[PDB]
Design a protein around this ligand. Structure first.
Ligand SMILES: CCCCCCCCCCCCCCCCCC(=O)OC[C@H](COP(=O)(O)OCCN)OC(=O)CCCCCCCCCCCCCCCCC
Ligand SMILES: CCCCCCCCCCCCCCCCCC(=O)OC[C@H](COP(=O)(O)OCCN)OC(=O)CCCCCCCCCCCCCCCCC
Ligand SMILES: CCCCCCCCCCCCCCCCCC(=O)OC[C@H](COP(=O)(O)OCCN)OC(=O)CCCCCCCCCCCCCCCCC
Ligand SMILES: CCCCCCCCCCCCCCCCCCCC
Ligand code: SF4
Lengths: 102, 60, 314, 162, 100, 198
């Protein structure tokens, strides 16, 4: 189709022009003008919780686009999925894993 | 935290938004220097001068 | 070279270029309008002398920031320091790249859509991380750890907040999302999704009240890149919110671009009102609200949306 | 279509090659992110749109973010790593590279002797992937949630500060 | 029109490159990075195999693969942080207390 | 008449780079971001100028960057203490070209009333100053007038457009002093309101 190749060209032009525009303004800023603690593990815990819940979120992303086709059985399966996820979140909250200040 | 505390906090945030919007719907309090000249009281302590008598000679 | 296919290709390329130029000038003029609207909220005027109504203040800022002395620290990594503003600009710019502004006026009619928005936000966190590392300052390093922890703690439910609109539309396409809002806008059924997406979009843009410094070592054009990328990102989040929860371009009387621009500008004004009104919460309550409250709210909202959809499908 | 696949595959190969031979951890992770973007481009050229979407959302958006988080947490200034150059001495890397090359030729000889009509590149949408995920693969989803929970519990138990 | 063999060759090249990085690097962090490269190459091979046959099985197995990869990266980084906390170095050859 | 810094010279200003110089000077003078540096009571009047009753935001001088890298103008508003003088000099060195200095108040001008053992007698002893404001404290509109004076000072100075092409020295105009310019109207004042009324 003509529309799809035109849309692909438009998206390619958008990406190229945006990247080249930011590069060109960086080059212009570089060109113009004359011259003259130990981090705790709570950050790791927060990032790891983000990673795990993001993978469970990707499973929910896959489910949400096909709710009608999956029927009530898919709703039941996602209900057990979300219940397990919420049990894990409640477990994390209740043991102080998500609490910053002790 | 308590759910009542969360509801009270949401209500007071909404009140803050509404009253800031009402302040936006109010009149400006800006004196526009230098287009608007600054009113100074007669005994204001600014630039120092030397003056003259009614006869016209210097008073110092 | 006279052929309708080449004419259509050139027209679509020009349409995408026009959209991009309007977006970058809208972000810069929105930085100026943020200054003006903060003046309006705080019972003052703001910049109104540089040109007619202050409209040339942005040009003065751009000329100053272009002709300022470009500085890279002596004991810093040059590639990462240069690359952080690149990410802070381009990531949320190409997050805008999927937004449909009008029927027949779109850049990319992708099958992923707000999935691509999620890819772009996950790329956008690297700007804060890289700016913190490349500064060679432990204060900016700790500030970047805190800012990146906040952005991760709210990107953990950004997509799940969008999943309600995904479920009701039945597809990831933005055109299908704005077509499914032909009768009732998504703000009414997906109200919890609407507030959670508002909070997540505020937090991932490093705006009031979810912010903080990792900006101290940048100056000149790199700081201007971070600034204009932040405002372009606010435009991006506002337009995505309009196209996801308020019907996008759909309206009774006005042309579709008029309705889309009016809703987008209203959300930008609401952003400035949020910045002017709300105070700064502390870190512990911010992360506790991000994890304990908003994420289960998005999960329960997705479950209720699925139950309502399957109940309404006879 | 094939142009994007070949260019992105070459970019990913070069980026991974620069990953395994680098001393700076942040530069190695940046080249790894570039390779992940290229591999997602390969995914999008093959019609697996969900694969590329989850490659940049999760693999280049969560896992690499966690790696950069750990690297900047450790403040790795290359102590006894930047000053050693041990992997660049040929007496260290000639052996394993020869072994991996031999395995690569064996796998390539195995690959070249299979029936291949080519890939049509028809876009497999995320809708069909979600249909198969919550259809014939229900137990896979539930036990994968169980596995993610187990990994979360173990990483919490190990990575505490006290 | 893209051959399946070329995608499988790309996946094999990435797999042996990640394994070479896993072997020749004495750092635990670069070992974990090479492990990440290997599991990503295996997921790439599964995606190519699934897209050749026109099935969602490849993408489903990729989803399971990246779930495992995320969990394994979390586990290895937790162990790396424990090692760096209790030994102040990431030398994988120095941690050889039991042998024979 | 101009002064060099790399010497009293003349005006060196085809026509294209002249318009470029005016545009660069216009962009620099219309967008000046002061550095948030709190020293003493003069900074209290500076932030009084920053509020809504005086509207320093109209001149585009309200961003108030907390880092000296992002700031173009240092407003030394307060006493130059001996302990704080290395801090002032280090913060001035952290700023990047182009940089201008406004001394606000008699303390920053000359030490003011505090000719004492622990006060440096003026910030011009160690950093160069572009604009001086008498007062203790100067009122906020006096600070805005000094900002305008700095604006017309910048508006005719000459600086290199790029670091690779042209003369890299900086030109500063030897402006006519405000005292001799305003003497024509100041001396002609004959009567003022008596101090017994409001
Ligand atoms: C500093 C620069 C760093 C590198 C930046 C990127 C470099 C490359 C720039 C040039 C790109 C040229 C254009 C590439 C093709 C664009 C069009 C495309 O991808 O089309 C394929 C597909 C079409 O989708 P659809 O229309 O729904 O299909 C139905 C029928 N075909 O659509 C899709 O599959 C869409 C999904 C893929 C879109 C990819 C967009 C770019 C991703 C990388 C962003 C990098 C951000 C900066 C760096 C971050 C930190 C490393
Ligand atoms: C396009 C996208 C953007 C759209 C723009 C428009 C929408 C903007 C949304 C902004 C959201 C801001 C959210 C701020 C959350 C702050 C949470 C927090 O940390 O609250 C802490 C505070 C105290 O908590 P506690 O632990 O009890 O501390 C007491 C200890 N002695 O807790 C409290 O005080 C309790 C209340 C917490 C906050 C509840 C939510 C308030 C949200 C702000 C008001 C929004 C009102 C509607 C605006 C218009 C919407 C169309
Ligand atoms: C040019 C020489 C090199 C210059 C420096 C490097 C620049 C970046 C090079 C890689 C990225 C761009 C590759 C070229 C893409 C051009 C567009 C294209 O080939 O589109 C084909 C196809 C469109 O979709 P489809 O429906 O399949 O179309 C079939 C046509 N009927 O497309 C698809 O199906 C998917 C297209 C690819 C996926 C989207 C883009 C991914 C970009 C990944 C960038 C990774 C980082 C690169 C960093 C480079 C610098 C270090
Ligand atoms: C904040 C708004 C950002 C908009 C970005 C895209 C701009 C595209 C401009 C399109 C102009 C034509 C729109 C279709 C024609 C019908 C409406 C005409 C009157 C506006
Ligand atoms: S000049 Fe006067 S008002 Fe200003 S810092 Fe000195 S004592 Fe304070």
């Amino acid at each position: 189709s003509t529309e799809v190749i035109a849309h692909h060209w438009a998206f390619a032009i958008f990406l190229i022009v945006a990247i080249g525009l930011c590069c060109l303004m960086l080059v212009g800023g570089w060109f113009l003008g004359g011259r003259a603690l130990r981090l705790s593990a709570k950050f790791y815990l927060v990032a790891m919780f983000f990673v795990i819940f993001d993978v469970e979120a990707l499973y929910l992303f896959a489910w949400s686009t096909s709710i009608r086709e999956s029927g009530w059985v898919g709703f039941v399966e996602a209900a057990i999925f979300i219940f397990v996820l919420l049990a894990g979140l409640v477990y994390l909250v209740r043991i102080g894993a998500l609490d910053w200040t002790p | 935290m308590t759910l009542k505390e969360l509801l009270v906090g949401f209500g007071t945030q909404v009140r803050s938004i509404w009253m800031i919007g009402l302040h936006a719907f109010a009149k400006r309090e800006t004196r526009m220097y230098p287009e608007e000249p600054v009113y100074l009281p007669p005994r204001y302590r600014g630039r120092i001068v030397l003056t003259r008598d009614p006869d016209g000679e210097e008073r110092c | 070279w006279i052929s309708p296919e080449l004419i259509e290709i050139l027209l679509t390329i020009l349409k995408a270029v026009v959209i991009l130029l309007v977006v970058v000038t809208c972000g810069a003029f929105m930085s100026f309008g943020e200054r003006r609207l903060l003046g309006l909220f705080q019972n003052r005027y703001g910049p109104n002398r540089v040109g007619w109504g202050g409209s040339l203040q942005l040009v003065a800022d751009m000329i100053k920031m272009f002709f300022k002395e470009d500085w890279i620290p002596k004991f810093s990594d040059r590639v990462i320091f240069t690359l952080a503003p690149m990410i802070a600009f381009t990531s949320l710019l190409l997050a805008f790249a999927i937004v449909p502004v009008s029927p027949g006026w779109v850049v990319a009619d992708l099958n992923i859509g707000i999935l691509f928005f999620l890819m772009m936000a996950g790329l956008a966190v690297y700007a804060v991380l890289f700016a913190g590392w490349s500064s060679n300052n432990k204060y900016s390093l700790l500030g970047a750890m805190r800012a990146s922890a906040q952005t991760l703690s709210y990107e953990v439910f950004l997509g799940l907040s969008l999943m309600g609109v995904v479920a009701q539309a039945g597809s990831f396409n933005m055109t299908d999302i704005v077509n499914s809002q032909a009768h009732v806008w998504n703000v009414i059924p997906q109200f919890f999704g609407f507030i959670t997406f508002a909070i997540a979009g505020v937090a991932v843009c490093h705006r009031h009240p979810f912010d903080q410094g990792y900006h101290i070592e940048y100056s000149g054009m790199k700081f201007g890149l971070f600034f204009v990328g932040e405002y372009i990102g606010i435009v991006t989040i506002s337009a995505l919110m309009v196209t996801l929860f308020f019907g996008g371009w759909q309206g009774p009387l006005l042309p579709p671009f008029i309705w889309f621009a009016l809703k987008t500008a209203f959300f930008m004004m609401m952003f400035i009102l949020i910045r002017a009104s709300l105070p700064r919460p502390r870190y512990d309550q911010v992360m506790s609200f991000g994890w304990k409250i908003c994420l289960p709210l998005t999960l329960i909202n997705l479950l209720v949306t699925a139950a309502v959809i399957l109940w309404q499908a006879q | 279509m094939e142009f994007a696949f070949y260019i992105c595959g070459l970019i990913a190969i070069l980026a991974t090659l620069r990953v395994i031979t680098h001393t700076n951890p942040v530069h190695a992770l940046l080249y790894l992110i570039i390779s992940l973007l290229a591999i997602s481009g390969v995914f999008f050229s093959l019609g697996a749109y969900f694969a590329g979407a989850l490659e940049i959302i999760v693999y280049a958006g969560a896992i690499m973010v966690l790696f950069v988080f750990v690297v900047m947490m450790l403040n790795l200034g290359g102590s006894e790593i930047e000053q050693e150059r041990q992997w660049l001495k040929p007496q260290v890397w000639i052996g394993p590279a020869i072994l991996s090359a031999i395995m690569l030729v064996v796998i390539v000889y195995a690959i070249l002797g299979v029936n291949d009509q080519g890939i049509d590149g028809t876009p497999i949408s995320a809708k069909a992937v979600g249909i198969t995920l919550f259809g014939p693969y229900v137990l896979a989803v539930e036990l994968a949630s169980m596995l993610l929970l187990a990994g979360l519990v173990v990483a919490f138990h190990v990575g505490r500060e006290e | 029109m893209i051959p399946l063999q070329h995608g499988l060759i790309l996946a094999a090249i990435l797999f042996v490159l990640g394994l070479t990085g896993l072997v020749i690097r004495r750092n635990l962090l670069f070992m974990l990075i090479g492990l990440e490269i290997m599991i990503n190459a295996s997921a790439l091979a599964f995606v190519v195999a699934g897209s050749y046959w026109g099935q969602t099985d490849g993408q489903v197995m990729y989803i399971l693969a990246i779930s495992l990869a995320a969990a394994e990266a979390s586990i290895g980084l937790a162990l790396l942080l424990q090692l760096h906390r209790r030994r102040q170095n990431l030398n994988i050859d120095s941690v050889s207390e039991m042998r024979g | 008449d101009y002064t060099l810094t790399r010497e009293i010279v003349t005006d060196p200003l085809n026509v294209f780079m002249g318009k470029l110089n005016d545009m660069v000077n216009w962009g620099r003078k219309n967008s000046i971001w002061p550095y948030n540096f709190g020293l003493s009571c003069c900074y209290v009047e500076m932030v009084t100028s920053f509020t809504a009753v005086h509207d320093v935001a109209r001149f585009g001088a309200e961003v108030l960057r907390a880092s000296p890298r992002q700031a173009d103008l240092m407003v030394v508003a307060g006493t130059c203490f001996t302990k704080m003088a290395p801090v002032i000099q280090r913060l001035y060195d952290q700023m990047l070209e182009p940089k201008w200095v406004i001394s606000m108040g008699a303390c920053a001008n000359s030490g003011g009333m505090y000719d004492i053992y622990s006060v440096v007698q003026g910030v011009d002893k160690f950093i160069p100053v572009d604009v001086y404001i008498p007062g203790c404290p100067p009122r906020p509109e006096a600070y805005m007038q000094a900002l305008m004076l700095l604006q017309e000072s910048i508006g005719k100075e000459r600086r290199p457009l790029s670091w690779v092409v042209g003369d890299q020295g900086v030109y500063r105009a030897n402006m006519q002093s405000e005292r001799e310019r305003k003497r024509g109207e100041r001396i002609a004042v004959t009567n003022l309101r008596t101090p017994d009324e409001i």
